[PDB]
Amino acid sequence: CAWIPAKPLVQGATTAQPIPGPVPVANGSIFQSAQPI
Amino acid sequence: ERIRDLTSVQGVRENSLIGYGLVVGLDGTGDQTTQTPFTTQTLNNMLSQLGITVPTGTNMQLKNVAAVMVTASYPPFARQGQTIDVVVSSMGNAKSLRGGTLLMTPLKGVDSQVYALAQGNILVGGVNQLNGGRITNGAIIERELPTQFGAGNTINLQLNDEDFTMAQQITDAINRARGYGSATALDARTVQVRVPSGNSSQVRFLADIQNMEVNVTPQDAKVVINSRTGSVVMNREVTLDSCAVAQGNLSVTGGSLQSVRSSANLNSVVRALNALGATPMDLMSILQSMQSAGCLRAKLEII
Amino acid sequence: ERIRDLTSVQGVRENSLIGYGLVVGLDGTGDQTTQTPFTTQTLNNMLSQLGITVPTGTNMQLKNVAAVMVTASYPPFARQGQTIDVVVSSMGNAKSLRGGTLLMTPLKGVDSQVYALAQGNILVGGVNQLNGGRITNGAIIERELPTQFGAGNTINLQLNDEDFTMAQQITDAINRARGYGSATALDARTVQVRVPSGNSSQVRFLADIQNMEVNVTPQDAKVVINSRTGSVVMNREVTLDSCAVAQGNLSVTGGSLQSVRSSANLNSVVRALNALGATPMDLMSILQSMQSAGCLRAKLEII
Amino acid sequence: ERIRDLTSVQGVRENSLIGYGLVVGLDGTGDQTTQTPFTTQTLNNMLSQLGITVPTGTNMQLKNVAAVMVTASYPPFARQGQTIDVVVSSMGNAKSLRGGTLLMTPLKGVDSQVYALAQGNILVGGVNQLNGGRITNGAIIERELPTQFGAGNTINLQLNDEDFTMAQQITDAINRARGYGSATALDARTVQVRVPSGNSSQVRFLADIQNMEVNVTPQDAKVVINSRTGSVVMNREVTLDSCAVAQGNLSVTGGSLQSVRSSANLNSVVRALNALGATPMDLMSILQSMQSAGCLRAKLEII
Amino acid sequence: MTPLKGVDSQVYALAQGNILVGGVNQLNGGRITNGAIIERELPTQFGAGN
Amino acid sequence: PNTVAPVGRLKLVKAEGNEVQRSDDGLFRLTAEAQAERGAVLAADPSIRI
Amino acid sequence: TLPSGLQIGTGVRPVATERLHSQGNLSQTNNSKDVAIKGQGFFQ
Amino acid sequence: VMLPDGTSAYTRDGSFQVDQNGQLVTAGGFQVQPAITIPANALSITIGRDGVVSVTQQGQAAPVQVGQLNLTTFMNDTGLESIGENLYIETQSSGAPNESTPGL
């Protein structure tokens, strides 16, 4: 049937939310690098 | 006096600003806009912002306008309202920026935030460079940076050149002047100074320190060779060892194998090397071979 | 006298204004309007505003009209009705602005608000620049800016060049003149002055302060090299160390490796460097190599 | 005498007027009307207004007519019936306005209201400018502006150049002349004067004040560089610091690195700079580099 | 404005300035003095041990 | 054919004709006065086309 | 402001030779491995 | 047309090719001053009795205009100086040239 609930091939949430970057440390620098892996 | 000429202070640094702008007023020595579309596009953006909408897909060929990149240096402790100097550089098929004027241009940091606004008249030297100019007091500071100067009881003097004896000399001088336990060397490039807590007391301390005088210790023997410009420089620590040298067209003033005596000071080195009668061009090759053999008791750097 | 030549006052700054305008009255040295559509379009806008509607899609080729950008500097504490000086610059394929007249033009800020209205006769020098001119008292101020001058008990004198000794000197001078606790240095670029509350008392204070005299302390040794114009400048703090130099076609007046003695003052430096007999063009390369080696005890800046 | 040469009065300002007109009587040096349609269109409008209707779509090629823009300056306190001077400028492909006559033209403000009517004979100089002229007493005032002069007990003298010492000097002079509490400085550009209420008493006050004499205090050291015309000007406050200078083709009258001594007054500066033997063209580059280094103790402005 | 990476592809310095070409000599190569500023620091075990 | 590359540029000078004298080998050189006025070696003007 | 100046020519010289890249006609070859391009293009 | 040095010279004959960029140049490399640019995939180019130049494209109902070819006129053309290669340069003999659209 077409009314029986089936799960989709691509499961879970299909979107992501950007996260705010860290607060810049108050040295004399403009270049701020978030923790780099 | 001297320490201010050898070190910098931690937290007191410069940053860089860059922006895009237009230069108007040229005597027909601007871009050929049929090959630089961003020129006409940004001119249309400016006109639209001012209140004039030019129809799209129309003919437009200017001659008195050039698209430029503006670069500046954000100074330490900069306050809003002050002024800095900017450098203006052409960026497409322009002939000259002789008598141009820079229109309102925002200067962004690396985080894409506006830190200064630039506008003024360009001074081109007037051979000389035509597509590059400098504007004096051409930008005004709009944003300020936070800093943690004055917080804590420790500053760091950062040497300009690594050395252990030099860091120890600076430490000993500061301790001789400003009390027993005032300074401490961390490594070959840092001196940690204890300062009273506050903002004015630290300024008094750094004003007292920056004008002290220290005697520079002998550095490393080194020979700098700039092959691109064709220059050779040897500081006062270079020595030599006795050895023979041969090179094309060079002879004794005798065969082609010339002797070189030992040399303790620099005058002896200059004399013994001038004895060979070689241009700097050949002197480079001679010095490289001598360093490879073992005569040259120095440190060769090709810059 | 002196302090007014070293610092600025916080809140007393200049702004920039820009606008678009037309210049009429040229002797056939205006735009070729078949390639600058905005010229004819804005002329039609003006004619329509005045009461004359020219049909669209008609032939129109002018010669005595040019489209220009007008730039001006909004001064501190500007009051409506006053006058400022404007700079007029061509913006498309015009030959000259020799005897032109600038029509009514509004000058906007960065927030797109009208701050001044510009109109007058252009003065072109009359080689010289033809596509750029200046109008004296060519704009009138229409809008005023708010400000918080006179509110509070603290002003900031902002130095033009960062230095700790200089800020301390200015602070000590103000404290010696205007009482014990009148000033306080915040950093290498700011001096915080306590002033009485009000508007006239602060003017009296700043009038007393701005004419004081301070003795400038020795700055940093630096050498400025402008490669675009071909110039070299060395302030009075540069020193040298004994070392040998070689460069193409330069010789002793002796081989090609010339000596350079130690130099404490600037006269000795000038003498020792003139001894090499080099044009400034080669002097740039020599100085770069010497700074890389360690002879030049200065700070090289390529501007 | 002096104060009238330093300040303006609040509410006493000039405005600008602009209008469109026709100039007739030229010796075949008018527009080529086949490319300026607005000329023939406005001529037809005028003829129709007078009582003659020319059929449309007919051939019409004139030679003794030119379309012009008329500009004028609305003076302070202007009364209807008075006369002002106008400037007439060609606006399309005309050769000369030598012996032309300006027909009846209304001059509008920025609110598109008629403030004056212009008509007269043009005076072209007769190289000189042909497409621009001036008419003396060529316009008559038709509308008057309201004003609030004479209402209140406070006027504002607005300085022409910002300065705290200057505002304080003017305030002190007015207080020394016209009683204790007559003036008060608001900022670096305004002096608030208390005047009796009325219209004639304020005129008596401003007549007494405007002719006072004040001694101008020393201004800021500044150097003006006009690169477009090729000129350099230095006021009497510029000083110098000892430093060395090198530039292409310049030599000692000695090598290429020339010394410059310290200079306290302006005569010393002129002497030391003339010693280098440089044209103004090179003097610009030298001054820019010196200001960047630190010798020039002035304020460089590129106008 | 140019970032200078190490061998691990991390930014250690930022470079910007005016080039000084000798002005035969080399035209396609130049050197900038004090043209880069350090942005990252390296750890080290100096001072630890005997 | 798309590998054709510029490799150099000729130096063309403009001489009026009344200030140039022939030499023994057969190469015209500037006279003393013209040489003093225009410099020892002429400058490659861009107005000449060949 | 003379009416003209005295100028003398020197001759003629072939400067360039172009090809008219128009569309030619088509002939039916009856073969099955012959291709004719209609429009603009080039085989590689 | 524009000479390499920077000055402007006038021609009369019409034989135009398109350079690699797309601009309209004469046989010899000299670029036509109005600088008409014809983009790629130009199925057909049209230059009418007026200066308008219109190019068609794939599946376009109406051709797109890519510029106009205005031409210059002289008060006295006999006084023009004739340098080689089918070019004339303005001189004092001929009056100041004026450019116009064809047919006007």
Swiss-Prot record, chain E:
Coiled coil (UniProt feature): none
Similarity comment text for this entry: Belongs to the FlgI family.
Function recorded in the entry: Assembles around the rod to form the L-ring and probably protects the motor/basal body from shearing forces during rotation.
Protein name: Flagellar P-ring protein
Source organism superkingdom: Bacteria
Organism, as annotated: Salmonella typhimurium (strain LT2 / SGSC1412 / ATCC 700720)
Complex and partners: The basal body constitutes a major portion of the flagellar organelle and consists of four rings (L,P,S, and M) mounted on a central rod.
Protein localization: Periplasm; Bacterial flagellum basal body
UniProtKB/Swiss-Prot annotation, chain F:
Domain of life per record: Bacteria
Localization: Bacterial flagellum basal body
UniProt family annotation: Belongs to the flagella basal body rod proteins family.
Subunit structure: The basal body constitutes a major portion of the flagellar organelle and consists of five rings (E,L,P,S, and M) mounted on a central rod. The rod consists of about 26 subunits of FlgG in the distal portion, and FlgB, FlgC and FlgF are thought to build up the proximal portion of the rod with about 6 subunits each.
The protein's name in its UniProt record: Flagellar basal-body rod protein FlgF
UniProtKB/Swiss-Prot annotation, chain G:
Localization per record: Bacterial flagellum basal body
Subunit structure: The basal body constitutes a major portion of the flagellar organelle and consists of four rings (L,P,S, and M) mounted on a central rod. The rod consists of about 26 subunits of FlgG in the distal portion, and FlgB, FlgC and FlgF are thought to build up the proximal portion of the rod with about 6 subunits each.
Family recorded in the similarity comment: Belongs to the flagella basal body rod proteins family.
Protein name per UniProt: Flagellar basal-body rod protein FlgG
Residues of the full protein shown: 61 to 104 of 260
Curated annotation (Swiss-Prot), chain H:
Record text on subunit structure and interactions: The basal body constitutes a major portion of the flagellar organelle and consists of four rings (L,P,S, and M) mounted on a central rod. The rod consists of about 26 subunits of FlgG in the distal portion, and FlgB, FlgC and FlgF are thought to build up the proximal portion of the rod with about 6 subunits each.
Organism: Salmonella typhimurium (strain LT2 / SGSC1412 / ATCC 700720)
Gene: flgG
Record protein name field: Flagellar basal-body rod protein FlgG
Annotated compartments: Bacterial flagellum basal body
Native organism taxonomy: Bacteria, Pseudomonadati, Pseudomonadota, Gammaproteobacteria, Enterobacterales
Family indicated by similarity: Belongs to the flagella basal body rod proteins family.
Transmembrane segments: none
